[PDB]
Amino acid sequence: ELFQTADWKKEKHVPVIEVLRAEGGVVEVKVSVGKEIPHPNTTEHHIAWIELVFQPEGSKFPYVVGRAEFAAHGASVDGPNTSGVYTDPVAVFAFKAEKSGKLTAFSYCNIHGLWMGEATLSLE
Amino acid sequence: ELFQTADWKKEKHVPVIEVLRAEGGVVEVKVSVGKEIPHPNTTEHHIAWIELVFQPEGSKFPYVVGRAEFAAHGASVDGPNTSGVYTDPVAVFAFKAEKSGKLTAFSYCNIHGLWMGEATLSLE
Amino acid sequence: ELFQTADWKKEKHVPVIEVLRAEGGVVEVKVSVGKEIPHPNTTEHHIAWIELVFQPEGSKFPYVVGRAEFAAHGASVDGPNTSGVYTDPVAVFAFKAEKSGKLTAFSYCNIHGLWMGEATLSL
Amino acid sequence: ELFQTADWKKEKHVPVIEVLRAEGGVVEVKVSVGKEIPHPNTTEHHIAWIELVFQPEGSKFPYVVGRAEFAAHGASVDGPNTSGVYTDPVAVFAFKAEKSGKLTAFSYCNIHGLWMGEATLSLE
Ligand SMILES: [Fe+3]
Ligand SMILES: [Fe+3]
Ligand SMILES: [Fe+3]
Ligand SMILES: [Fe+3]
Numbered sequence: 001e002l003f004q005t006a007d008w009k010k011e012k013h014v015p016v017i018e019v020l021r022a023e024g025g026v027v028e029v030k031v032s033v034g035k036e037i038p039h040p041n042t043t044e045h046h047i048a049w050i051e052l053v054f055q056p057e058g059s060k061f062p063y064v065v066g067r068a069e070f071a072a073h074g075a076s077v078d079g080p081n082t083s084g085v086y087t088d089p090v091a092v093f094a095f096k097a098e099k100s101g102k103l104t105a106f107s108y109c110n111i112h113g114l115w116m117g118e119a120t121l122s123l124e
Numbered sequence: 125e126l127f128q129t130a131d132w133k134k135e136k137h138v139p140v141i142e143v144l145r146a147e148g149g150v151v152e153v154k155v156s157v158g159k160e161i162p163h164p165n166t167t168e169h170h171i172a173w174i175e176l177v178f179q180p181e182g183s184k185f186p187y188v189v190g191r192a193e194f195a196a197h198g199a200s201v202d203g204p205n206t207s208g209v210y211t212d213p214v215a216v217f218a219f220k221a222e223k224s225g226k227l228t229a230f231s232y233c234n235i236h237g238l239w240m241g242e243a244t245l246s247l248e
Numbered sequence: 249e250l251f252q253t254a255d256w257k258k259e260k261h262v263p264v265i266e267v268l269r270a271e272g273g274v275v276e277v278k279v280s281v282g283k284e285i286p287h288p289n290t291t292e293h294h295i296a297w298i299e300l301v302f303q304p305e306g307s308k309f310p311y312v313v314g315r316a317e318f319a320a321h322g323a324s325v326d327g328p329n330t331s332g333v334y335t336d337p338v339a340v341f342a343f344k345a346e347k348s349g350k351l352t353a354f355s356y357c358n359i360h361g362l363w364m365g366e367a368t369l370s371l
Numbered sequence: 372e373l374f375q376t377a378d379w380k381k382e383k384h385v386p387v388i389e390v391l392r393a394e395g396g397v398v399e400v401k402v403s404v405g406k407e408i409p410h411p412n413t414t415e416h417h418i419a420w421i422e423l424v425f426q427p428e429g430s431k432f433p434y435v436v437g438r439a440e441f442a443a444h445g446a447s448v449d450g451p452n453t454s455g456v457y458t459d460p461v462a463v464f465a466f467k468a469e470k471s472g473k474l475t476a477f478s479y480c481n482i483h484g485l486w487m488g489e490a491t492l493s494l495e
């Protein structure tokens with residue numbers, strides 16, 4: 001596939017999905033790349049975005065929940081890696097849901113292609 | 125002007141910026157629309173996105189930090205407002221920042237136009 | 249498989265890729281959904297975006313070329329399907345390329361899930 | 372103000388709006404940065420996106436027509452400016468429009484901040 005699923009040893013790209021809460025009709029999911037072992041974030045090499053998808057049990061189709069773009073990577077008029085602003089690739093999606101189902105996240109590294117992570121959403 | 129800046133009495137559109145955390149050279153900034161008086165989120169009327177901008181003091185130009193798209197609004201093959209999935213218009217942007225500066229957020233209601241909120245990041 | 253690849257009879261979802269120009273590696277690629285048999289575009293049911301990916305031959309990784317979001321679906325303060333403005337799901341991606349390779353397009357319908365189309369770029 | 376409107380001399384940033392076609396109730400609008408004098412497109416410096424907004428005359432609010440992201444700027448595992456792939460900052464937006472009205476375009480250079488362009492759609 002275009003969508004890579006297994007991280008290499010020394011650099012992490014697979015978007016990791018953490019269900020922070022799922023009860024009372026409401027869900028909070030954090031998705032990150034390189035949470036424990038940071039991926040580079042330079043003008044030349046960085047994670048550009050994460051998109052989260054959710055398919056409720058019994059829904060014939062999945063739904064895009066949302067997308068987070070990480071847009072600052074240090075560039076400035078003074079050269080690459082000079083602005084002191086770098087957006088970390090971690091996003092929090094809050095959404096209503098009524099059933100459990102499957103979470104899929106996609107992410108993109110500007111030089112290492114496309115990536116997919118997956119997790120079950122158990123709604124209390 | 126195109127970017128509206130003062131809420132109306134009954135429905136809330138101005139994006140609200142909150143610094144949640146600033147430690148270790150990383151800032152976490154929450155942006156939300158309607159945290160207190162919730163904006164509608166239906167198939168026909170919803171907040172589509174929030175974009176955050178940061179201009180460090182002394183920087184000649186502002187930088188986009190990132191953009192969050194809130195993509196689920198209830199639509200399904202069964203009709204509007206039936207999928208049970210609605211993305212809340214709240215995002216958290218985690219970024220490296222070296223200096224105090226000005227935070228500006230833009231947001232969009234699909235029927236009520238474009239909006240802007242502003243806040244100050246003070247690092248000392 | 250989240251990415252559907254085969255259209256239904258009555259409603260068209262697969263992003264169709266047309267290379268308009270590939271000369272001197274100045275490349276224009278049009279991508280559309282429902283070009284000949286239009287997909288609905290209402291407040292309730294529409295194509296929300298198309299994304300184009302290109303992997304040059306010899307490149308170990310693919311690159312996102314760009315993404316086009318189609319944001320207007322007739323919503324207004326007067327009700328659904330009243331603004332008079334609807335964005336058609338067609339985009340043109342202009343880019344430079346040095347080698348031939350593989351194009352992949354992705355698109356999304358707010359109710360019928362995710363879709364993929366593929367084509368070859370021959371410079 | 373954040374949205375700059377007047378180009379410098381050496382380098383063009385203002386997005387230029389052109390109505391290419393208007394028939395059958397559908398309008399095609401091209402928006403580009405640097406069509407005469409091209410803006411740089413390097414791993415370090417590039418136009419990242421253009422967004423188009425349309426407000427039909429008599430409509431109390433504007434509508435975002437759509438957004439185009441130009442995501443490739445030469446980065447590869449071989450270093451900056453080595454992939455062979457660069458996305459030109461030109462987009463075409465095709466949309467149904469019933470009425471004349473005002474077109475606004477926004478664009479972003481990753482080191483030179485935010486930009487605005489304006490034009491009139493005349494349908495008679
Ligand atoms: Fe990487
Ligand atoms: Fe509203
Ligand atoms: Fe559909
Ligand atoms: Fe520039």
